[PDB]
Design a protein around this ligand. Structure first.
Ligand SMILES: Nc1nc2c(ncn2[C@@H]2O[C@H](COP(=O)(O)OP(=O)(O)OP(=O)(O)O)[C@@H](O)[C@H]2O)c(=O)[nH]1
Ligand SMILES: Nc1nc2c(ncn2[C@@H]2O[C@H](COP(=O)(O)OP(=O)(O)O)[C@@H](O)[C@H]2O)c(=O)[nH]1
Ligand SMILES: [Mg+2]
Lengths: 428, 41, 428, 158
């Protein structure tokens, strides 16, 4: 009941998924052999939301690893938690995508869907009651963005009732991870506005401050950032897996969050995050979780919420606590700094709780914000796109795959409207 | 059929606003804080 | 023969079911395994062919994540496994889903239980509906269920204990909407509807109980103390045994006005009893105190149409008629002119029971007041503001319209509230 | 007159009826008493009903072969009398339903003029073979009396 099927697209997706399935596995006390070795009966009761029973007491994940150039898969196929995956769920192409949204969506991606769909359905029907899909993308490259969206449009029509999530990692403002990044960005956005129920945005930049400011790290490697992203992807489905005195399914989290069908871009954070020195001073009380999650620093995206208004928000607390302190705090903020919250929504936060904190903590939280500052990711992208599409630079690669050019402008009008939707509703 | 040629052809608010009405303000309520500020927190 | 049917709908429905049914099992020496080491329990239980005392209630919900806790808790040998009804997918805080899509496919099951739950019943007092307005399951299923109960029995009485959305505390954003939609369906179908807010019961736990970490499990340990006091006459001897029909006749002047308030006294910590005597005189002054209300309404802005007082313990009627007499004289309490009377009083010799691990104190005198007042228009006009503030933009509508609903159901359920608030002013 | 809108895109052909007109040789006019908004026209095939402000004919009570003559409204607001070339009078109503009665052989051939009393209690029928008759009419029982008023030629009007 209430199963979930999970997709990992691209190099980034095939690497965030490495830590995600490592984090969730430990939380349910299963070995890299796949055998359950936990203690409580609380791990087993909702284990089938991510895994499947197998002969011998194994628990194999319900993930789908898709990628061109399986080189990066050979890493995770060799890592410590690489022995758990089904080998038939590895779908890959022998050629490369070349950081090119076109061939990752038109030529090569189109050659794998016939096989990918036999994979997704084979484990979508084993679900006695499917809850939804969830993907992990990278809006910079070609494989993650291109094949990701093409996979979505096939998913959106085959399963329109169920809900698809998206932990899309978006480009960084101050540095360019690739050169053709703005082309792959918009052409993917133009697919997400229409074919996604919810979509969180992350940035490798903000993922550095939290390790440079909050965590006070020294050598933050991607192996650590993915331990951050995996902390929110685990923080969403707690109510699905663990009981709590105020549960929150995955669906009731959208209807309380998205007023209009196109503003489905969010902004996430996590709490508590302290150094290995400060854990001696700072205490763990709901007033602490509530201020650090609300701050303009734990926002894992590089968009300052203090430039717009909060339409709605959320909070998924974890750990046996007092349901009153939570309710009075989240209330105390809205009427405290009343200039950042819209007025035609009286109470614009939802609050969840769980009897089960993380594996090694006592209290924890997770934040989801739908702010009208998310438009700032789109302006900064809408300009870098129009500076180079203006002179038709790097386009012979995209048109070389038979692409048109109105698919570029349609990707810009669709965006340059989405930047206005976030302004009528922001009366400042 | 009844010889009724005269009957052949037929030829023939704001809700309200209560007095108690009012928006809840962070006063006269002991559950929460008693101020409203622009950007305190 | 003096028996009732106790329904629990939603999460808070079964959240209070765990407090109420932990009381009656303890108030009658019923072990969690059914049996105990007549008519003292026949109000709530049914002795089988041998020893076992199963309750007569029904836990109804859509998320198994809570109804299964009852299946694994210590009260699993107690319930008939069919009473604990549950579903696969949830209402997702969306009135439409709980009414049009999912509600229609399990009511046919729930209703069969009631038919098999009423045949053993020889003389049925009335149904008992524990509901939580503000969620899809609480508002949608509850609405769809009540209409089915009206057309089956009609002559039987339905009592609605519905948690209502508070002014400040709000665990959701769209809870204004489905709280409005509930009225058009509860009003014509419930015989009488008690109200109580999660916020008002919070402050009760601050001044009186002095408990600083309140939780849903605390408040429910107060509601159970109401119904225990309310149905004491049904199962415990006492001067002026008050049934339901008697209770209902002299409280509801007009078929519309059946929305009433509640109170309880004394509510004190187990140590401040050492600083008080808690006479019959002292308690009844505190029942009419505005801070002792279980709803955030102010009775000093309105007038009383009736009151009902259920005393308990070492109480004799010579002191009831005295304390009531010194209240009609008090200036603060205003009684609407067309009732010079207004008190139906009930006495019991069975003092209120205390649960181990509870917060209240063992006392010998206790009072539960249930007043029908015209100040109730306050809490009912706040909703008329938040609904008209968000509905001006059709926010969150595309969720309701996408689940087999329409735009008329919003304006229709809106006028019914205006049609109601006039009725709370014609009585001036 | 029909307006046939046809689109070959989806090969869809829908017709509408814009205007209707009588066939030929409208024989008789009739106005319901104290009514200046609807009227009735007896023609050579059947009876049509029209109204004042617009054409928009209301109904067409059809009799296949033989033609109608001298349509009439029973007084004070009542049935419609119609004498036909058969030599028979027939009564209809507002919705006109089914034939109220049929006074058959009302004349030799081709009853030509028809009138009613101010009390709607008797009906005069002047035939084409130079004769006048009157029929007494009850509520549900008809009375066929033998007036036989002999005239010198066809009765144009009564
Ligand atoms: N007094 C009290 N109120 C509760 C409790 N649990 C939830 N509530 C309130 O009930 C309201 C939501 O009702 P729910 O039952 O959780 O939601 P639902 O009716 O099941 O509909 P779905 O969430 O879609 O399944 C919230 O406003 C809560 O504050 C409780 O244990 N005690
Ligand atoms: N959090 C995290 N982000 C990464 C990592 N590796 C790459 N990214 C981002 O992924 C982007 C490039 O997309 P990529 O996945 O390499 O191309 P693709 O194979 O076509 O999807 C760049 O913006 C990288 O910064 C990683 O290891 N951890
Ligand atoms: Mg619920």
């Amino acid at each position: 009941m209430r199963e979930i099927v999970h997709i990992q697209g691209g190099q980034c997706g095939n690497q965030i998924g490495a830590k995600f399935w490592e984090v969730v596995s430990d939380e349910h006390g299963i070995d890299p052999t796949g055998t359950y070795h936990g203690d409580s009966d609380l791990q087993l009761e909702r284990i089938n939301v991510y895994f499947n029973e197998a002969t011998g007491g194994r628990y194999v994940p319900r993930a789908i690893l898709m990628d061109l150039e399986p080189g990066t898969m050979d890493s995770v196929r060799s890592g410590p938690y690489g022995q758990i995956f089904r080998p038939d769920n590895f779908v890959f192409g022998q050629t490369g995508a070349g950081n090119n949204w076109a061939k990752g969506h038109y030529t090569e991606g189109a050659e794998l869907i016939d096989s990918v769909l036999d994979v997704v359905r084979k484990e979508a029907e084993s679900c006695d009651c499917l809850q939804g899909f969830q993907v992990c993308h990278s809006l910079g490259g070609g494989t993650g963005s291109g094949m990701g969206t093409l996979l979505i449009s096939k998913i959106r029509e085959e399963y329109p009732d169920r809900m698809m999530l998206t932990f899309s990692v978006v480009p960084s403002p101050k540095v360019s991870d690739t050169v053709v990044e703005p082309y792959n960005a918009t052409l993917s956005v133009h697919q997400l506005v229409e074919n996604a129920d919810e979509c969180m945005v992350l940035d490798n930049e903000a993922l550095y401050d939290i390790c440079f400011r909050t965590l006070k790290l020294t050598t933050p490697t991607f192996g650590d950032l993915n331990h951050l992203i995996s902390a929110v992807m685990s923080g969403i489905t707690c109510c699905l897996r663990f009981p709590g005195q105020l549960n929150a399914d995955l669906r009731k989290l959208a209807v309380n969050l998205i007023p209009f069908p196109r503003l489905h871009f969010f902004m996430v954070g996590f709490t508590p995050l302290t150094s290995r020195g400060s854990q001696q001073y700072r205490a763990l009380t709901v007033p602490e979780l509530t201020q650090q999650m609300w701050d303009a620093k734990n926002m894992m995206c590089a968009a300052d919420p203090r430039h717009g208004r909060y339409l709605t928000a959320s909070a998924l607390f974890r750990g046996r606590m007092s349901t009153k302190e939570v309710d009075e705090q989240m209330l105390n903020v809205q009427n405290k700094n009343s200039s950042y919250f819209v007025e035609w929504i009286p109470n614009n936060v939802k609050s969840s709780v769980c009897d089960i904190p993380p594996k090694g903590l006592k209290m924890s939280a997770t934040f989801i914000g739908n702010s009208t500052a998310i438009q700032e990711m789109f302006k900064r992208v809408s300009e870098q796109f129009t500076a180079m599409f203006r002179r038709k630079a790097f386009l012979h690669w995209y048109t070389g795959e038979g692409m048109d050019e109105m698919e570029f402008t349609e990707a810009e009008s669709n965006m340059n409207d989405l930047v206005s939707e976030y302004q009528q509703y922001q009366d400042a | 059929q009844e010889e009724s040629v005269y009957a052949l052809i037929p030829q023939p608010p704001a809700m309200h606003t209560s007095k108690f009405g009012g928006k809840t303000h962070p006063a006269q309520f002991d559950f929460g804080q008693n101020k409203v500020q622009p950007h305190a927190t | 023969m003096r028996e009732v049917i106790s329904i629990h709908i939603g999460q808070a429905g079964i959240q209070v079911g765990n407090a109420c049914w932990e009381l009656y099992c303890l108030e009658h020496g019923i072990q969690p395994d059914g049996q105990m080491p007549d008519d003292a329990f026949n109000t709530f239980f049914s002795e089988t062919g041998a020893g076992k005392h199963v309750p007569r209630c029904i836990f109804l919900d859509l998320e198994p994540t809570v109804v299964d806790e009852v299946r694994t808790g210590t009260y699993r040998q107690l319930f008939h496994p069919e009473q604990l009804i549950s579903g696969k997918e949830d209402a997702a805080n969306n009135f439409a889903r709980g009414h049009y899509t999912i509600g229609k496919e399990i009511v046919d099951l729930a209703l069969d239980r009631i038919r098999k739950l009423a045949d053993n019943c020889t003389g049925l007092q009335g149904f008992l509906v524990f509901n939580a307005v503000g969620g899809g399951t609480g508002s949608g299923l509850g609405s769809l269920l009540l209409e089915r109960l009206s057309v089956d029995y009609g002559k039987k009485s339905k009592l609605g204990f519905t948690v209502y959305p508070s002014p400040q505390v709000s665990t959701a954003v769209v809870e204004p909407y489905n709280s409005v939609l509930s009225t058009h369906s509860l009003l014509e179908h419930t015989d009488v509807a008690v109200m109580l807010d999660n916020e008002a019961i919070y402050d009760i736990c601050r001044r009186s109980l002095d408990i600083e970490r309140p939780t849903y499990t605390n408040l429910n340990r107060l509601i159970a103390q109401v119904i225990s006091s309310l149905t004491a006459s049904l199962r415990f001897d006492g001067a002026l045994n008050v049934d339901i029909t008697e209770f209902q006749t002299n409280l509801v002047p007009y078929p519309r006005i059946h929305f009433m308030l509640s109170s309880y006294a004394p509510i004190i910590s187990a140590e401040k009893a050492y600083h008080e005597q808690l006479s019959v005189a002292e308690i009844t002054n505190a029942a009419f105190e505005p801070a002792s209300m279980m709803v955030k309404c102010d009775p000093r802005h309105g007038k009383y149409m009736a009151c009902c007082l259920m005393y308990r313990g070492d109480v004799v009627p010579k002191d009831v008629n005295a304390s009531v007499a010194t209240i009609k004289t008090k200036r603060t309490i205003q009684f609407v002119d067309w009732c010079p009377t207004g008190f139906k009083c009930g006495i019991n010799y069975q003092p209120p029971t205390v649960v181990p691990g509870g917060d209240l104190a063992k006392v010998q005198r206790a009072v539960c007041m249930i007043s029908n007042s015209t100040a109730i228009g306050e809490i009912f006009s706040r909703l008329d503001h938040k609904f008209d503030l968000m509905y001006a933009k059709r926010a969150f509508v595309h969720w309701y319209v996408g689940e087999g609903m329409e735009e008329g159901e919003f304006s229709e359920a809106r006028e019914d509230l205006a049609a109601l608030e006039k009725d709370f002013e014609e009585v001036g | 007159i029909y307006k046939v809108t046809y689109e070959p895109a989806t090969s869809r052909l829908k017709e509408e009826l814009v205007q209707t007109a009588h066939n030929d040789k409208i024989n008789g006019m009739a106005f319901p008493n104290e009514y200046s908004e609807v009227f009735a026209t007896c023609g050579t095939g059947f009876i049509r009903l029209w109204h004042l402000t617009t054409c928009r004919e209301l109904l067409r009570i059809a009799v296949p072969n033989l033609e109608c003559f001298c349509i009439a409204f029973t007084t004070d607001g009542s049935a419609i009398l119609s004498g036909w070339s058969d030599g028979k009078i027939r009564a209809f109503g507002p919705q006109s339903g089914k034939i109220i009665f049929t006074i058959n052989d009302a004349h030799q051939k081709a009853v030509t003029a028809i009138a009613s009393t101010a009390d709607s209690s008797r009906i005069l029928s002047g035939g084409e073979e130079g004769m006048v008759r009157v029929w007494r009419i009850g509520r549900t029982s008809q009375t066929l009396e033998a007036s036989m008023k002999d005239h010198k030629g066809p009765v144009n009007c009564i």
